[PDB]
Design a protein around this motif. Structure first.
Motif, PDB file in Angstrom:
ATOM      1  N   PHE A   2       1.062  -1.427   0.246  1.00  0.00           N
ATOM      2  CA  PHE A   2      -0.236  -0.305   0.047  1.00  0.00           C
ATOM      3  C   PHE A   2       0.874   1.394   0.002  1.00  0.00           C
ATOM      4  N   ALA A   4       0.080   4.822  -1.572  1.00  0.00           N
ATOM      5  CA  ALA A   4      -0.694   6.157  -1.049  1.00  0.00           C
ATOM      6  C   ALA A   4      -0.626   5.862   0.043  1.00  0.00           C
ATOM      7  N   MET A   5      -1.541   4.867   0.847  1.00  0.00           N
ATOM      8  CA  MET A   5      -1.203   4.575   1.640  1.00  0.00           C
ATOM      9  C   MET A   5      -0.262   5.032   2.888  1.00  0.00           C
ATOM     10  N   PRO A   6      -0.495   5.160   4.059  1.00  0.00           N
ATOM     11  CA  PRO A   6       0.427   6.041   5.282  1.00  0.00           C
ATOM     12  C   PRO A   6       1.745   5.218   6.218  1.00  0.00           C
ATOM     13  N   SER A   8       1.949   1.007   6.212  1.00  0.00           N
ATOM     14  CA  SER A   8       1.163  -0.734   5.768  1.00  0.00           C
ATOM     15  C   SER A   8       2.374  -2.106   6.386  1.00  0.00           C
ATOM     16  N   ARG A  16      -4.860  -1.593   6.909  1.00  0.00           N
ATOM     17  CA  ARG A  16      -4.212  -0.255   6.429  1.00  0.00           C
ATOM     18  C   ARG A  16      -3.462   0.122   7.992  1.00  0.00           C
ATOM     19  N   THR A  17      -3.536   0.977   8.448  1.00  0.00           N
ATOM     20  CA  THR A  17      -3.015   1.282  10.194  1.00  0.00           C
ATOM     21  C   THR A  17      -3.415   0.387  10.851  1.00  0.00           C
TER      22      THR A  17
END
Length: 83
Positions: A2, A4-6, A8, A16-17
């Motif tokens: 992931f 784009a995601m912050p 992972s 996600r988080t």
């Protein structure tokens, strides 16, 4: 994983988080290895078995929640497009 995601990679082994869908497979592990979710505001956010807040992922990782909890929420997984 992931982009784009912050982030992972450290606790999110699929999510996600979160602390990993693991805790998810837990609730479904006792209810059905099939695999379950977590705080799914299906019907309506403020309209579901007093839970969610107990982040079985964030609350489990934070609030020592063995399998006893996952069994408590034994919530009916919400299939739609998991993968």
């Amino acid at each position: 994983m992931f982009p784009a995601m912050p982030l992972s990679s450290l606790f999110v082994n699929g999510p996600r988080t979160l602390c990993g869908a693991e805790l998810v497979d837990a609730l479904q592990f006792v209810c059905g290895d099939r695999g379950f979710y977590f705080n799914k505001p299906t019907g309506y956010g403020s309209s579901s078995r007093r839970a969610c807040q107990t982040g079985i992922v964030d609350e489990c990782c934070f609030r020592s929640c063995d399998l006893r909890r996952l069994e408590m929420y034994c919530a009916p997984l919400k299939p739609a497009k998991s993968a």
